[PDB]
Design a protein around this ligand. Sequence first.
Ligand code: CL
Ligand code: CL
Lengths: 145, 137
Amino acid sequence: APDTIINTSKEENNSYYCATAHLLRTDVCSLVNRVGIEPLKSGSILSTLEELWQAVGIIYRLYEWQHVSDIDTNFKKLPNNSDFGLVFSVLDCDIGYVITGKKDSKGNIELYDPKNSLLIENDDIKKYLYDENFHRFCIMLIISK
Amino acid sequence: EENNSYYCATAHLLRTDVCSLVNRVGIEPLKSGSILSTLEELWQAVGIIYRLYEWQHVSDIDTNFKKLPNNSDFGLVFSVLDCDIGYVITGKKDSKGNIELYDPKNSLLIENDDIKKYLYDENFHRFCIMLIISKSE
Ligand SMILES: [Cl-]
Ligand SMILES: [Cl-]
């Protein structure tokens, strides 16, 4: 349940905190006052994203590392009205990077990068994944809260 | 009752028993109709921190085993031809790198070589590994 917030600063405003707070529809202050300030567990953003979801009670299904060429095939197999996390490997990043996404009733995809306030809809999604130097990806589909 | 694989599998991995697990936790029902969902929700409750794997066919299981690091405890949720829901067993990759599987509800222990025979006998179709990172007994 949301607390009063100013988006806070330093490094609670990381992808994985920011992506998790958007999907739970809460804020990063509610996220640090419960659970705490999570360091990078085991060096993998995936591991720290997963264990942040375990801490806050998100029940998810995981889809393993694949090349970004076959991402629309994963998009097509997702159920309609579904929210999910998206961990990407990046050419100029030594760790992963997390964005959020949703599938609407009509089967469209919308992607949201909360840390950079970036919102992408179908028909701009291909250009975005290319512009962002995304290579591999891993989808975390929420089942329940 | 509470003699269910997911409770029994979680209590075997935690090095405890289900009755002292259930005064913790309570008796949580089948969340979302999913044995996977119920295992995840039971593990978050008790503090088992896991890495979730993609559902995969049982044929590709020896490769998943092959990539697991030594000294690993894990759960394994199976799809079963004659079961409407999943079934949970426990697993280990010890220091020497052998795989051992334990079905707690039916007290069965399976080691390498018998694993292909075992998974075929049990009518398992796909599977999903939950690798333990952290316990709090
Ligand atoms: Cl709202
Ligand atoms: Cl990883």
